[PDB]
Chain A
Amino acid sequence: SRLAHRLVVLSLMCFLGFGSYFCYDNPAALQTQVKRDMQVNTTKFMLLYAWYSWPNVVLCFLGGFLIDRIFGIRWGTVIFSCFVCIGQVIFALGGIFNAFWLMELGRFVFGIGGESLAVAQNTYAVSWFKGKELNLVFGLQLSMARIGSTVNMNLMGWLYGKIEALLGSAGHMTLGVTLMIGCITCIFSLICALALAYLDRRAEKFSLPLILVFVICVCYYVAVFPFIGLGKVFFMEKFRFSSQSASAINSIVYIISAPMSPLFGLLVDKTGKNIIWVLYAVAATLVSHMMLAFTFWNPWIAMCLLGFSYSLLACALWPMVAFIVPEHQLGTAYGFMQSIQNLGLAVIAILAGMILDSKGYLLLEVFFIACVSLSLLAVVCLYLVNRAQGG
């Protein structure tokens, strides 16, 4: 056929993002452990993630602008994955030279690399896979990060011990080569990017509702994630859970997302009015928060619906900006959405942390429910607006 019924491009697209979604959780997988290397306190070790979230909104907006204007869709991925690999190798160098500000500088590049790669992947998948099987590629893109993060978390820890036993006991400088052996993932992203560019070379031969969709994305993705980030402490007080078995509840909204999102992506495009699906997902999220906050029913039931209402809102809301704004402008709208969502998460994490100790736990759930209510109001307003024009 054209390109073998999109099979090879579908296979290659999912493997592109190992540059960002694999090596992102190195400090998380290396919690403590490297703390006793030279000297590390808890306050400083959170700076390895601040550089990945705060200097991001303007930089990702600039990256999207560059994709739209100068670089184009083709060469955007190859340069951003190059930035990713440069950041990873300079992080490894900072590890090997024992300097810490060399370690810190790696995040100032890896953040732009990851966010720009994500926005480029999104816009490219929208540009090419349009027409049929559209919502599904977002499903695999979401599933790949969750299927890779845990694997990296286990594998880096295993390789630390393997290298320590095999090579020997040096002056605890082996973490640098340990990062280097983990750096081999990023080169695969480069190879995939050049292969995709070659295929594309061979292949060749705003508006009102956009603001509302931005509001939906901000509201939902800012009222869902920090609740999971809070996690441990709330369930040890509101309910009586053991210190070990309580990790199943907090880490099940993620582990149920990846094995499910492709199914919803495959189902939605086939006879699906997207607005109805989004409204159903938002109503389910509201019901889940109400049940969790205002009653002592089993948290399993209240947290199960969140998995579906988060795996269904994804790969069924982002394609809305694929139809509203026409081609030649996706690279800016997607970057704007990423910037506003990241800024919302960053500004609300601090607010939630500040209000938690000052007012307790009921007010936090009240505020979250208010945010989701605003999300639903904007969803139904978007439904109302689309009634007149349509299509």
Chain B
Amino acid sequence: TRQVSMEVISGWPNPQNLLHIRAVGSNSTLHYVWSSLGPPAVVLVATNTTQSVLSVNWSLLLDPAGALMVLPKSSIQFSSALVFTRLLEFDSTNAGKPYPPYSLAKFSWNNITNSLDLANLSADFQGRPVDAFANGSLTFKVQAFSRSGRPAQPPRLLHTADVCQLEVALVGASPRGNHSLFGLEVATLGQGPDCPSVNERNSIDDEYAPAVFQLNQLLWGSSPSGFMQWRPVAFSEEERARESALPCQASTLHSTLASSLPHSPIVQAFFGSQNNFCAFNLTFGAPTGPGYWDQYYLCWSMLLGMGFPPVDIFSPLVLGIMAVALGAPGLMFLGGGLFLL
């Protein structure tokens, strides 16, 4: 149980979008920052103190290397970041002729305050190109949370009132071929010099989002810290039914050098490493079955935030049916004694 609060900043020399999310509880605070200057980006800040604020300076951000920090420097711990640096056009017309990627740096993202509404705790990012995405573009859907619960959307996750949601989609696209395969290039940034470890977990319960039993994870440290999580599925149409599975695939983490991906100014402001970038491609779908040809839009869901990653909990229904199933052998032992008398 923690509070929520949104806030936006604009600069007179050059207005741009900036959404800052603050969650405060008893003795812990979170400092999600969502910037879309050139690329979309996320930076996490954890403070053991219950009071902490930001210090913005648009003058430095106007080769910027300014400081965007918090006053309690001693409370700084586990600062991490993600950068959705590129969108990859994967073709593989036979089973794959890598059409040149679209750079997520020349998009004129719309005003946040137009779509922001604290009642539902959501915001929209939509950039469009300057030269594809003629009608509509990527639509990022950031969302905070207040209490533990389960969303009603067809991709059902388990938020712990301490994480965020990043339903990402793009509406309206003209493919460069008669095939559907899209990809994103997630580039993490570990606080310490190491390689983040990605694993794969197995779950018994399948009441939620049927036909999948795997719950991916990505931990920046073997300790209480931040974590990624997403069910390996992707939906293409609003009535997200079991038909449109469209499986997604991960990759292996590399250690790429600088200048291989565009640099987000927000990350350079929060950090000073800019050399330990680790990126992995993230494809959607396969030519095996249903793809992205009938519709014009692809949706994905994932979490982000610090805390203990939820696993699953069995629902009362299956537990009760198991209980009544176990009643059958026990019932006769009562009945057997009845005939015994």
Q: Which of B196-228 contact A (CB under 8 A)?
A: 202, 204-208, 210-213
Q: Is A381 an interface residue (CB 8 A)?
A: yes
Q: Which of B2-26 contact A (CB under 8 A)?
A: none
Query: Which of A296, A356, A363, A370 contacts B325 (CB under 8 A)?
Result: A370
Q: Which residues of A contact B318 (CB under 8 A)?
A: 362-363, 366
User: Bound state CA distance, A238 and B324, in angstroms?
Assistant: 25
Q: Is A46 an interface residue (CB 8 A)?
A: no
Known: A381-B335, A384-B335, A384-B339. A357 touches B328 (CB 8 A): no
Known: A362-B205, A384-B339, A387-B339. A373 touches B210 (CB 8 A): no
Q: Which residues of B contact A370 (CB under 8 A)?
A: 321, 324-325
User: Bound state CA distance, A362 and B208, in angstroms?
Assistant: 10
B255 to chain A, nearest CB (A): 29
Q: Is the CB of A360 within 8 A of B332?
A: no
Query: Which of A237, A294, A381 contacts B211 (CB under 8 A)?
Result: A237
Give how many B residues have a beta carbon under 8 Å from the other chain's beta carbons.
26
Q: Which of A321-371 contact B (CB under 8 A)?
A: 356-357, 359-363, 366-367, 369-370
B168 to chain A, nearest CB (A): 25
B215 to chain A, nearest CB (A): 14
B308-341 to A contact mask, C-beta < 8 Å, 1/0? 0000000001100110111011011001100100
Q: Is B106 an interface residue (CB 8 A)?
A: no
- A-B pairs with beta carbons under 8 Å apart, 19 shown: A237-B212, A237-B213, A294-B204, A296-B202, A357-B210, A357-B242, A360-B208, A360-B210, A361-B206, A362-B204, A362-B205, A363-B207, A369-B322, A370-B321, A373-B325, A373-B328, A374-B328, A377-B331, A380-B329
Query: Which of A238, A384, A388 contacts B332 (CB under 8 A)?
Result: A384
User: Bound state CA distance, A361 and B339, in angstroms?
Assistant: 40
Q: Which residues of B contact A381 (CB under 8 A)?
A: 332, 335
User: Bound state CA distance, A373 and B327, in angstroms?
Assistant: 9
Q: Which residues of A contact B208 (CB under 8 A)?
A: 360
Q: Is A126 an interface residue (CB 8 A)?
A: no
User: Bound state CA distance, A360 and B245, in angstroms?
Assistant: 13
Query: Which of B207, B324, B331 contacts A359 (CB under 8 A)?
Result: B207
B interface residue numbers (CB < 8 A to A): 202, 204-208, 210-213, 241-242, 317-318, 321-322, 324-326, 328-329, 331-332, 335-336, 339
User: Bound state CA distance, A213 and B332, in angstroms?
Assistant: 17
Q: Is the CB of A360 within 8 A of B328?
A: no
Query: Which of B211, B241, B325 contacts A360 (CB under 8 A)?
Result: B211
User: Bound state CA distance, A190 and B213, in angstroms?
Assistant: 53
Counting chain B CB atoms within 10 Å of each CB, which of A233, A296, A360, A388 scores highest? Answer: A360
B231 to chain A, nearest CB (A): 13
Q: Is A119 an interface residue (CB 8 A)?
A: no
Q: Is the CB of B210 within 8 A of A361?
A: yes
Known: A357-B242, A373-B328. A366 touches B322 (CB 8 A): yes
Q: Which residues of A contact B205 (CB under 8 A)?
A: 362
User: Bound state CA distance, A380 and B329, in angstroms?
Assistant: 9
Closest to B327 in A: A373
Q: Which residues of B contact A357 (CB under 8 A)?
A: 210, 241-242
User: Bound state CA distance, A369 and B202, in angstroms?
Assistant: 22
User: Bound state CA distance, A86 and B326, in angstroms?
Assistant: 51
A351 to chain B, nearest CB (A): 15
User: Bound state CA distance, A30 and B206, in angstroms?
Assistant: 36
Q: Which residues of A contact B242 (CB under 8 A)?
A: 357
Q: Which residues of A contact B325 (CB under 8 A)?
A: 366, 369-370, 373
Q: Which residues of B contact A356 (CB under 8 A)?
A: 210
Q: Which residues of B contact A359 (CB under 8 A)?
A: 207, 210
B42 to chain A, nearest CB (A): 32
Q: Is A179 an interface residue (CB 8 A)?
A: no
Closest 4 CB pairs of A and B: A360-B210, A377-B328, A373-B328, A360-B206
Q: Is A306 an interface residue (CB 8 A)?
A: no
Q: Is the CB of B322 within 8 A of A360?
A: no
Q: Which residues of B contact A233 (CB under 8 A)?
A: 211
User: Bound state CA distance, A296 and B202, in angstroms?
Assistant: 9
Counting chain A CB atoms within 10 Å of each CB, which of B208, B241, B242 scores highest? Answer: B242
A362 to chain B, nearest CB (A): 5
Q: Is the CB of A384 within 8 A of B336?
A: yes
A204 to chain B, nearest CB (A): 45
Known: A360-B211, A387-B339. A376 touches B328 (CB 8 A): yes
Q: Which of A291-313 contact B (CB under 8 A)?
A: 294, 296
User: Bound state CA distance, A370 and B328, in angstroms?
Assistant: 9
Q: Which of A23-53 contact B (CB under 8 A)?
A: none
Closest to B241 in A: A357
Q: Which residues of B contact A237 (CB under 8 A)?
A: 211-213
User: Bound state CA distance, A178 and B164, in angstroms?
Assistant: 64
Q: Which residues of A contact B332 (CB under 8 A)?
A: 377, 380-381, 384
Q: Is the CB of A362 within 8 A of B202?
A: no
Known: A360-B207, A384-B336, A384-B339. A238 touches B213 (CB 8 A): yes
A sample of 12 more A-B contacts (CB under 8 A), given A237-B211, A357-B242, is A360-B206, A360-B211, A361-B211, A362-B318, A363-B207, A366-B321, A373-B325, A376-B329, A377-B332, A380-B332, A384-B332, A384-B339
Closest to B213 in A: A238
Q: Which of A216-241 contact B (CB under 8 A)?
A: 233, 237-238
User: Bound state CA distance, A296 and B321, in angstroms?
Assistant: 21
A357 to chain B, nearest CB (A): 5
